[PDB]
């Protein structure tokens, strides 16, 4: 528990406990970060 | 009153298949990855030569002198093989593979030995400088369990 | 008055064998075909080399540099293996096999990749030109159900 | 006056076990032999290589490069496996086996195909010359009924 919702404007949204939010953010940003090196 | 030998033996072969299911399913995946590795290799030649002859890693397939098109170096389970600055990455197709390994990939990269180079094999990596690469951390790496003992190399292996 | 446990349990093992009969009979045939495939392969080497060295597919076994006699490349379920213009066909014996697969065969053929070739495995095919084959449609072809997932290639597979 | 349903059904299960006794007893033995065969094989590799590399059959286990001690290649039903001039014989233990197959054995031997060899599996044999073996007629051979369909080879099989 926890979930992720994909909005049309390519934003992720998470509900959860802070601890599962934190994990999901760290992974989303970490994978975003190899994508910024264009 | 009687017939349980037919009922149990049809139900032991049923559960035998369920126990033989995960064994054939990783033996299977582990087999489909062993090829991504063979498709990745044999392209070491081009890359090695390019490096030793010029002292710079081949930027892409064409530079390395291989099917200018990544998709032209595909296979049954391999959707392709791209050379990116001497690093050769192999992608797993989406059809005909396990389930937790498709669209997933590995990399082969080398290091200047000075007069020659040494090759490594492991989870996807990116090249930073002519003698340094790093984890292409992104989530599409083939899981350690599916990789041979000969392809467990880390980004900083020397 | 009594004895039905012995009568039913002898008749459940009897019907258990009847249910286990078709399973062992295609597992069995599927096993005898997996070998026709192994006997067909390993002859890819000769054929590949002949093609890459000369640019023409080996006309027959002798050309490919293999047992000049098709019948000399037989097995337990394999009555032979003939190379016909680079296409290697394996015939199923008549004794020691399933029942709907004997005297039946498959083919392995390759395609110029330009600098190398790629191999296919499937139902009998004939070579038309150096880069085109067709269904050796004979009704002598081993039925799709008996062929591995790795040997479902069509005459026009690329 | 009454109770015969309990008496007959306890006596039909008793006779059912007596009918199921010989079926489980050859299925069983036939199972213990199928392993002597697996232990014998996998040692074909050593023997094949030794022959192809030198043109002479390995005289004994050590020559073939395997547990220098026959007894070191034993199993549950297998008391050992000895290589004697390329011929690999498997002996059935004395404890844990059928009754008419213990201390009994089979052999695997090969024949020069010229450039390769072909393997046979059957009742014990002795090697005469580099391309000829003969029945190790002596009375300790595993009975034909206990041997798979794939291991019915005769001393002169080609």
Q: Give domain limits for chain B.
A: 2-158
Contact residues on chain D for C96, CB-CB shorter than 8 A: 149
From residue B2, alpha-carbon distances to B118, C16, C18, D16, D23 in Å are: 69, 13, 17, 11, 18
Q: Which chains touch D (3 or more CB pairs under 8 A)?
A: C
- Residue at token pair 């005289």: D59
What's the rounded Cα separation, in Å, for the pair D83 and C73?
A: 28
Give the D window 127-156 contacts with C, CB below 8 Å.
149-150
What's the rounded Cα separation, in Å, for the pair D158 and D153?
A: 9
Contact residues on chain C for B46, CB-CB shorter than 8 A: none
Three-state SS sequence of chain B: CCCCHHHHHHHHHHHHHHHHHHHHHHHHHHHHHHHHHHHHCCCHHHHHHHHHHHCCCCCCHHHHCCCCCHHHHCCCCEEEEEEECCEEEEEECCCCCCCCCCCCEEEEEEEECCCCEEEEEECCEEEEECCEEEECCCCCECCHHHCCHHHCECCCCC
Buried b (16+ CB within 10 A) or exposed e, C109-139: bbbeeeeebeebbbbbbbbeeeeebeebeee
- Both tokens assigned to B123: 């989870």
Neighbours of D80 (CB within 10 A): 21
Look at A27 and B139 and tell me if their CB atoms are within 8 Å.
yes
Is residue C63 within 8 A of residue C56, CB to CB? The reply is no
Contact residues on chain B for C12, CB-CB shorter than 8 A: 2-7
Look at C16 and B6 and tell me if their CB atoms are within 8 Å.
yes
- Both tokens assigned to B13: 């072969």
CATH number of D2-158, picked from 2.40.50.100, 3.40.50.1370, 3.30.700.10, 3.30.499.10: 3.30.700.10
- Total number of residues shown for chain D: 158
End-to-end CA distance of chain A: 35
Neighbours of C1 (CB within 10 A): 8
Beta-bridge partners for C150: none
- Both tokens assigned to B121: 């094999």
Closest CB to B9: pick one of C8, C16, C149.
Answer: C16
Give the residue among D76, D154, D80 at the shortest CA–CA distance from D121: D154
CB under 8 Å to D38, separation ≥6 — which residues?
none
CA distance C116 to chain D (A): 26
Look at B3 and C19 and tell me if their CB atoms are within 8 Å.
no
- Residue at token pair 């980004």: B155
What's the rounded Cα separation, in Å, for the pair B98 and B36?
A: 13
CB under 8 Å to B92, separation ≥6 — which residues?
B32, B33, B36, B77, B78, B79, B101, B102, B103, B104, B105, B142
Is B12 at the interface with chain C, CB within 8 A? no
- Both tokens assigned to D19: 């009918």
CA distance B59 to chain A (A): 15
Give the residue among B138, B107, B133 at the shortest CA–CA distance from A33: B138
Give the residue among D142, D150, D151, D40 at the shortest CA–CA distance from D98: D142
- Residue at token pair 């080497």: C45
- The secondary structure element, H or E, covering residue D125 is strand D125-129
- Residue at token pair 């009153």: B1
From residue C129, alpha-carbon distances to C33, C87, D36 in Å are: 28, 11, 51
From residue A30, alpha-carbon distances to A37, B112, B142 in Å are: 12, 29, 18
Is residue B158 within 8 A of residue B132, CB to CB? The reply is no
């Amino acid at each position: 528990g926890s979930v992720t919702v994909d909005q049309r404007t390519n934003v992720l949204i998470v509900k959860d406990v802070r601890s599962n939010t934190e994990r999901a953010r760290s992974l989303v940003r970490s994978l975003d970060t190899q994508t910024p090196q264009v | 009153f009687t017939l349980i030998e037919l009922m149990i033996v049809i139900a032991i072969v049923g559960i035998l298949a369920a126990v033989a299911l995960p064994a054939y399913q990783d033996y299977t995946a582990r087999a489909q990855v062993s090829e991504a590795i063979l498709l990745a290799e044999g392209q070491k030649s081009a890359v090695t030569e390019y490096y030793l002859n010029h002292g710079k890693w081949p930027e892409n397939n064409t530079s390395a002198g291989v099917a200018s098109s990544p998709t032209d170096i595909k296979g049954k389970y391999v959707k392709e093989v791209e050379v990116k600055n001497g690093v050769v990455t192999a992608t797993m197709l989406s059809s005909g593979v396990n389930n937790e390994i498709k669209g997933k990939k590995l990399s082969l990269w080398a290091r200047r030995e000075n007069g020659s180079v040494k090759w490594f094999c492991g989870q996807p990596v990116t090249r930073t400088d002519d003698d340094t690469v790093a984890d292409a951390k992104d989530g599409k790496e083939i899981d350690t369990k599916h990789l041979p003992s000969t392809c467990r190399d880390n980004f900083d292996a020397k």
